[PDB]
Structure formats: C-alpha cells, structure tokens
Amino acid sequence: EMANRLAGLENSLESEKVSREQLIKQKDQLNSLLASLESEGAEREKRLRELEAKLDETLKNLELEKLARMELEARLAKTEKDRAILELKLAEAIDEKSKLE
C-alpha cells in the first residue's frame, strides 16, 4: 500500500516538475520581452523629448520670421511710395526748368 503511495507521489512530483519548467521558461521569455520593451521605450522617450524641443524651436523661428516679413512688406511699400513721389517731383522740376527755357 505504501510502496504504491510512493510511486504515485513520485508521479505527482514529476508532473509538478513539468509544470514548473513550463512556467519558468514562459517567465524567462516575459522577462526578456520586458527588458527589451523598457530599453526601446527609453530610447523613444528620449527621441520624443528631442522632437518636442525641435518643434518648439522651429515654431519660435517661424514666428520671428513672419514678423520680420511683415515688417519688410510694410517698409518696402513706404519706400516704393517715396520713390514714386520723387520721380513725380523730379519730372515736375525738369519741366518747370524746360518751360523756363
């Protein structure tokens, strides 16, 4: 009776062994997965942080440049107008001269 309980206990021990080995292999794979994903994530968060800074900077610059552009379109119109005004005044003068001939 007892030599039997002996055989069955060993049997039960071996079945617990196969289970144990299955779970440990599964765990190893999860741990590797884990480490990997962590590393990957570290790299991407660093990369993301960099992208963010770059978009902020570029954004600033785009803004500064729009102001600058507008300021110049204005300055240019003012100058263009003055230039036109002078050509007209010039004509007027070369003519008052002409007529004084």
Added chain:
Amino acid sequence: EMANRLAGLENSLESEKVSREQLIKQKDQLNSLLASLESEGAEREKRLRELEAKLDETLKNLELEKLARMELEARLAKTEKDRAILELKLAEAIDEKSKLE
C-alpha cells in the same frame, strides 16, 4: 523507511505546489505589465508620428518664409538705393531751376 520516506515526499510535493502557485502569480504580474507597457508604447509612437508630421510642416514653412524675407530684404535695399539716388537727382534739379531763374 516507507512511512517516513512517505510523509517526506508529501512534504516535498507540498512546498512545490506552493512554488508553482508563486510562479503563476509572478507570471501573471509580468504579463499584465507587458500589456501596459505595450499600450503605453503604442500611444508614444502615435504621438511621435504626430510630432514628426508637425515638425516637417513647420520646417517647410520656416524655409518658405525665410526665402520670402530674404527676397524682401533685397528688394528693400534696391528700392532704398534708388530712392537715395532720386533725392540727389531731385536736389540737383530744383537747384538748376533756382539758378536758371
């Protein structure tokens, strides 16, 4: 022997089913972890993809506005120079009018 060897193996089997409960538990925690990290990573990659698109756009824009601004700086200098030459010409003419009279 036999009776002893028995209660013995029952002890062994005992601690081992306990260990197995534990591995199952650690495994479950790992798997949950894995799901979370993967979801988190999916999100971060989505956000990264978005930032990249935005950075490309803004970069284009920065470039175009920079060309526009340089074109204007040039245009403005040319105009200012012509205006200066015209003020001079003007003076010269209002003076030729003066002397003439």
